[PDB]
């Protein structure tokens, strides 16, 4: 399938070259997979979600996304126009308040919630969790992400926006999850993207157009935007039967575009997420 005039990041993930604007992908489109977006919530009523998004948990007075960040990330996972996996089921877990902040204890509870809640959902092709969040190093936060991954969920986490080594941030520094850095439309490391040995993969993260609250759209930048590209890609590849939750990060790294990014520091992988779809 071909989506013309797609956001640059979608075009990038199905291309061996930067500078194109059509997204190519298998029509299965993540059907039968599920992606949890652990964030500020999701505006499930947005027409871009086509009824495929729902809130399943909040730790606050509302499950509504009063911020926009979670809606944007969910849109990159699975919205009809802005999403990688256009037929996946999206589940919102609101661990971040409407200012975008959340206590680590609430974030940990949200991860353990997903590990159990997947047993209440129909996801025959597999389960992914997208975590566009993080703070300073915490062994307990890393351990929660490790448990979620161990439970059979492909966990994708943002590397962080400190232009520094991700070893000092969590859950970015957890070895067993998929830590995602950000690139721009010219295949440069995004100027804010963290780096280091713990990174597994880069995805599009600078000037990413997606859904926003109020039934709107907007373009924003961050490793928070790269993460859902990888989460959606994992769901898409699991639906195709090409990988599993336990091995999807390594498979994405195996099949990535290699050596094509600039300003990647020595010792950080030079790997850009790629669907290898042959139309």
Short mmCIF file of C-alpha atoms in Angstrom, two decimals:
data_model
loop_
_atom_site.label_atom_id
_atom_site.label_comp_id
_atom_site.label_asym_id
_atom_site.label_seq_id
_atom_site.Cartn_x
_atom_site.Cartn_y
_atom_site.Cartn_z
CA UNK A 1 0.00 0.00 0.00
CA UNK A 2 1.12 3.58 -0.69
CA UNK A 3 0.18 6.72 1.26
CA UNK A 4 1.08 9.79 -0.77
CA UNK A 5 2.10 13.07 0.88
CA UNK A 6 2.81 11.24 4.13
CA UNK A 7 4.68 12.83 7.04
CA UNK A 8 8.41 12.64 6.38
CA UNK A 9 8.98 10.15 9.20
CA UNK A 10 6.54 7.61 7.79
CA UNK A 11 8.16 7.94 4.37
CA UNK A 12 11.56 7.57 6.02
CA UNK A 13 10.74 4.28 7.74
CA UNK A 14 9.83 2.63 4.42
CA UNK A 15 12.74 4.08 2.43
CA UNK A 16 16.40 3.38 1.80
CA UNK A 17 16.86 7.15 1.24
CA UNK A 18 15.85 10.41 2.91
CA UNK A 19 13.94 13.03 0.97
CA UNK A 20 10.82 11.16 -0.15
CA UNK A 21 7.20 11.71 0.83
CA UNK A 22 5.28 8.45 0.24
CA UNK A 23 4.87 5.77 2.93
CA UNK A 24 4.84 2.16 1.69
CA UNK A 25 3.59 -0.66 3.89
CA UNK A 26 1.87 -4.03 3.86
CA UNK A 27 -1.92 -3.65 3.98
CA UNK A 28 -2.12 -5.86 7.10
CA UNK A 29 -1.13 -2.62 8.86
CA UNK A 30 -0.78 -4.09 12.37
CA UNK A 31 -4.27 -5.65 12.37
CA UNK A 32 -4.65 -7.92 15.39
CA UNK A 33 -1.84 -6.27 17.37
CA UNK A 34 -2.21 -3.86 20.28
CA UNK A 35 -0.10 -0.90 21.37
CA UNK A 36 -0.33 0.62 24.84
CA UNK A 37 0.57 4.32 24.92
CA UNK A 38 1.71 5.06 28.47
CA UNK A 39 1.54 8.83 28.60
CA UNK A 40 -0.84 11.79 29.21
CA UNK A 41 -3.80 9.89 27.70
CA UNK A 42 -5.30 9.68 24.21
CA UNK A 43 -8.13 11.75 22.72
CA UNK A 44 -9.87 8.61 21.50
CA UNK A 45 -12.66 10.63 19.84
CA UNK A 46 -10.22 12.07 17.29
CA UNK A 47 -11.46 11.03 13.82
CA UNK A 48 -7.89 9.99 12.98
CA UNK A 49 -8.20 6.99 15.35
CA UNK A 50 -11.34 5.61 13.65
CA UNK A 51 -12.64 4.08 16.89
CA UNK A 52 -9.46 1.99 17.32
CA UNK A 53 -8.25 3.96 20.38
CA UNK A 54 -9.58 3.72 23.92
CA UNK A 55 -8.49 4.75 27.40
CA UNK A 56 -8.03 1.75 29.70
CA UNK A 57 -6.52 3.31 32.84
CA UNK A 58 -5.89 6.63 34.54
CA UNK A 59 -4.34 7.56 37.89
CA UNK A 60 -5.90 11.06 37.86
CA UNK A 61 -9.36 12.66 37.99
CA UNK A 62 -9.87 12.11 34.26
CA UNK A 63 -8.64 9.78 31.55
CA UNK A 64 -8.79 12.64 29.04
CA UNK A 65 -5.58 13.92 27.48
CA UNK A 66 -5.56 17.52 28.67
CA UNK A 67 -2.02 17.97 27.32
CA UNK A 68 -1.73 16.62 23.76
CA UNK A 69 1.56 14.74 24.14
CA UNK A 70 -0.05 11.30 24.49
CA UNK A 71 -2.47 11.95 21.63
CA UNK A 72 0.45 12.95 19.40
CA UNK A 73 2.42 9.81 20.26
CA UNK A 74 -0.64 7.59 19.79
CA UNK A 75 -1.18 9.22 16.40
CA UNK A 76 2.33 8.27 15.29
CA UNK A 77 1.73 4.67 16.41
CA UNK A 78 -1.59 4.13 14.71
CA UNK A 79 -3.62 7.03 13.33
CA UNK A 80 -4.98 6.68 9.80
CA UNK A 81 -2.89 9.54 8.36
CA UNK A 82 -0.03 9.97 10.81
CA UNK A 83 0.50 6.40 12.01
CA UNK A 84 2.90 3.58 11.24
CA UNK A 85 0.47 0.71 12.04
CA UNK A 86 -2.82 2.00 10.72
CA UNK A 87 -4.97 -0.94 11.86
CA UNK A 88 -3.55 -1.59 15.35
CA UNK A 89 -5.62 -1.25 18.51
CA UNK A 90 -4.47 1.60 20.77
CA UNK A 91 -4.83 1.49 24.56
CA UNK A 92 -4.18 4.62 26.61
CA UNK A 93 -2.71 4.46 30.12
CA UNK A 94 -2.62 7.92 31.72
CA UNK A 95 0.40 7.95 34.04
CA UNK A 96 1.25 11.59 33.25
CA UNK A 97 -0.87 14.52 34.38
CA UNK A 98 -2.10 17.26 32.06
CA UNK A 99 1.13 19.20 32.65
CA UNK A 100 3.06 16.21 31.27
CA UNK A 101 4.52 15.13 34.62
CA UNK A 102 4.17 11.96 36.64
CA UNK A 103 5.58 10.45 39.80
CA UNK A 104 7.82 7.44 39.27
CA UNK A 105 5.57 5.36 41.54
CA UNK A 106 2.58 6.05 39.26
CA UNK A 107 4.63 5.28 36.13
CA UNK A 108 5.73 1.96 37.68
CA UNK A 109 2.13 1.10 38.57
CA UNK A 110 1.16 1.85 34.97
CA UNK A 111 3.79 -0.55 33.60
CA UNK A 112 2.68 -3.34 35.93
CA UNK A 113 -0.90 -2.56 34.91
CA UNK A 114 -0.08 -3.15 31.23
CA UNK A 115 1.66 -6.46 31.99
CA UNK A 116 -1.56 -7.73 33.56
CA UNK A 117 -4.11 -5.83 31.44
CA UNK A 118 -2.95 -7.44 28.20
CA UNK A 119 -4.56 -10.63 29.52
CA UNK A 120 -7.89 -8.78 29.33
CA UNK A 121 -7.42 -7.74 25.68
CA UNK A 122 -7.51 -9.47 22.30
CA UNK A 123 -4.07 -9.08 20.70
CA UNK A 124 -3.48 -12.30 18.74
CA UNK A 125 -0.55 -10.79 16.83
CA UNK A 126 1.17 -9.42 19.92
CA UNK A 127 1.45 -6.53 22.34
CA UNK A 128 3.66 -3.42 22.33
CA UNK A 129 4.08 -0.62 24.88
CA UNK A 130 5.31 2.85 23.92
CA UNK A 131 6.87 4.92 26.73
CA UNK A 132 7.58 8.48 25.56
CA UNK A 133 8.64 9.55 29.05
CA UNK A 134 11.54 9.38 31.46
CA UNK A 135 13.59 11.05 34.14
CA UNK A 136 16.78 10.47 36.08
CA UNK A 137 18.27 7.04 36.69
CA UNK A 138 16.08 4.80 38.84
CA UNK A 139 16.67 1.09 39.35
CA UNK A 140 13.00 0.64 40.24
CA UNK A 141 11.79 2.32 37.05
CA UNK A 142 14.21 0.22 34.99
CA UNK A 143 13.06 -2.94 36.76
CA UNK A 144 9.41 -2.14 36.02
CA UNK A 145 10.23 -1.76 32.32
CA UNK A 146 12.21 -5.01 32.44
CA UNK A 147 9.23 -6.82 33.98
CA UNK A 148 6.87 -5.49 31.34
CA UNK A 149 9.22 -6.72 28.60
CA UNK A 150 9.70 -10.08 30.35
CA UNK A 151 5.91 -10.49 30.50
CA UNK A 152 5.77 -10.65 26.69
CA UNK A 153 5.32 -6.99 25.69
CA UNK A 154 7.62 -5.28 23.20
CA UNK A 155 8.67 -2.23 25.25
CA UNK A 156 9.93 0.84 23.38
CA UNK A 157 11.20 3.78 25.44
CA UNK A 158 12.46 7.26 24.62
CA UNK A 159 16.20 7.81 24.97
CA UNK A 160 15.62 11.34 26.27
CA UNK A 161 16.24 14.91 25.07
CA UNK A 162 19.36 15.90 27.03
CA UNK A 163 21.96 15.58 24.22
CA UNK A 164 23.80 13.31 26.66
CA UNK A 165 24.48 9.66 27.39
CA UNK A 166 21.21 7.88 28.14
CA UNK A 167 22.96 5.81 30.86
CA UNK A 168 21.83 8.43 33.41
CA UNK A 169 18.11 8.26 32.56
CA UNK A 170 15.26 5.80 33.17
CA UNK A 171 13.70 3.78 31.66
CA UNK A 172 16.12 4.67 28.80
CA UNK A 173 19.01 2.92 30.55
CA UNK A 174 17.23 -0.43 31.06
CA UNK A 175 19.16 -2.90 28.86
CA UNK A 176 16.30 -5.29 28.08
CA UNK A 177 13.88 -2.77 26.49
CA UNK A 178 14.20 -0.96 23.14
CA UNK A 179 15.76 2.47 23.70
CA UNK A 180 14.97 4.86 20.84
CA UNK A 181 16.94 7.92 19.75
CA UNK A 182 15.76 10.62 17.34
CA UNK A 183 16.83 11.66 13.84
CA UNK A 184 15.83 14.48 11.49
CA UNK A 185 14.68 14.61 7.87
CA UNK A 186 18.28 14.98 6.64
CA UNK A 187 19.42 11.82 8.47
CA UNK A 188 21.23 13.79 11.18
CA UNK A 189 21.00 12.83 14.83
CA UNK A 190 18.39 15.16 16.27
CA UNK A 191 20.18 17.97 18.08
CA UNK A 192 18.56 17.07 21.43
CA UNK A 193 18.72 13.29 21.14
CA UNK A 194 20.48 11.33 23.84
CA UNK A 195 23.01 8.71 22.71
CA UNK A 196 25.27 6.05 24.19
CA UNK A 197 25.76 2.30 24.32
CA UNK A 198 22.23 1.69 25.66
CA UNK A 199 20.53 2.99 22.49
CA UNK A 200 19.16 0.24 20.26
CA UNK A 201 17.73 2.18 17.32
CA UNK A 202 16.92 5.65 15.96
CA UNK A 203 13.62 6.80 14.55
CA UNK A 204 12.25 10.05 13.10
CA UNK A 205 11.96 12.62 15.87
CA UNK A 206 12.42 16.19 14.55
CA UNK A 207 9.33 18.02 13.20
CA UNK A 208 6.88 15.10 13.40
CA UNK A 209 3.30 15.84 12.34
CA UNK A 210 0.64 13.91 14.25
CA UNK A 211 -2.71 14.19 16.01
CA UNK A 212 -3.34 16.73 18.76
CA UNK A 213 -6.17 17.41 21.19
CA UNK A 214 -9.24 19.30 20.08
CA UNK A 215 -9.39 17.13 16.98
CA UNK A 216 -6.35 18.94 15.61
CA UNK A 217 -2.81 18.21 14.36
CA UNK A 218 0.60 19.66 15.06
CA UNK A 219 4.28 19.04 14.47
CA UNK A 220 6.59 18.69 17.49
CA UNK A 221 10.04 17.24 18.15
CA UNK A 222 11.56 14.81 20.62
CA UNK A 223 12.67 11.30 21.31
CA UNK A 224 9.03 11.03 22.42
CA UNK A 225 8.16 11.24 18.71
CA UNK A 226 10.76 8.67 17.59
CA UNK A 227 9.62 6.08 20.14
CA UNK A 228 6.09 5.57 18.69
CA UNK A 229 7.55 5.13 15.20
CA UNK A 230 9.45 2.12 16.57
CA UNK A 231 6.48 0.89 18.63
CA UNK A 232 4.22 1.07 15.59
CA UNK A 233 6.87 -0.62 13.45
CA UNK A 234 7.11 -3.46 15.98
CA UNK A 235 3.32 -3.95 15.94
CA UNK A 236 3.36 -3.94 12.13
CA UNK A 237 6.18 -6.50 11.96
CA UNK A 238 4.54 -8.75 14.58
CA UNK A 239 1.29 -8.75 12.59
CA UNK A 240 3.33 -9.81 9.55
CA UNK A 241 4.79 -12.70 11.54
CA UNK A 242 8.34 -11.48 10.96
CA UNK A 243 9.24 -11.13 14.65
CA UNK A 244 7.92 -11.54 18.20
CA UNK A 245 7.68 -9.26 21.22
CA UNK A 246 10.80 -10.76 22.81
CA UNK A 247 12.94 -10.26 19.70
CA UNK A 248 11.38 -7.29 17.88
CA UNK A 249 13.96 -4.74 19.06
CA UNK A 250 16.83 -6.94 17.89
CA UNK A 251 15.00 -7.71 14.62
CA UNK A 252 14.44 -4.00 13.98
CA UNK A 253 18.14 -3.40 14.61
CA UNK A 254 19.07 -6.34 12.33
CA UNK A 255 16.95 -4.97 9.48
CA UNK A 256 17.60 -1.25 10.02
CA UNK A 257 19.19 1.15 7.58
CA UNK A 258 22.82 1.03 8.74
CA UNK A 259 25.45 3.76 8.77
CA UNK A 260 23.23 6.40 7.17
CA UNK A 261 22.94 8.85 10.08
CA UNK A 262 25.34 11.71 10.75
CA UNK A 263 26.68 13.02 14.07
CA UNK A 264 26.28 9.67 15.83
CA UNK A 265 29.00 9.61 18.53
CA UNK A 266 31.54 6.80 18.56
CA UNK A 267 30.04 3.86 20.47
CA UNK A 268 26.38 4.57 19.66
CA UNK A 269 24.61 2.42 17.07
CA UNK A 270 24.09 3.97 13.63
CA UNK A 271 20.78 2.26 12.87
CA UNK A 272 17.58 3.85 11.55
CA UNK A 273 14.26 1.99 11.83
CA UNK A 274 13.17 0.54 8.49
CA UNK A 275 10.24 -1.70 7.53
CA UNK A 276 11.95 -3.34 4.50
CA UNK A 277 8.59 -3.37 2.75
CA UNK A 278 8.99 -4.30 -0.91
CA UNK A 279 5.96 -2.95 -2.77
#
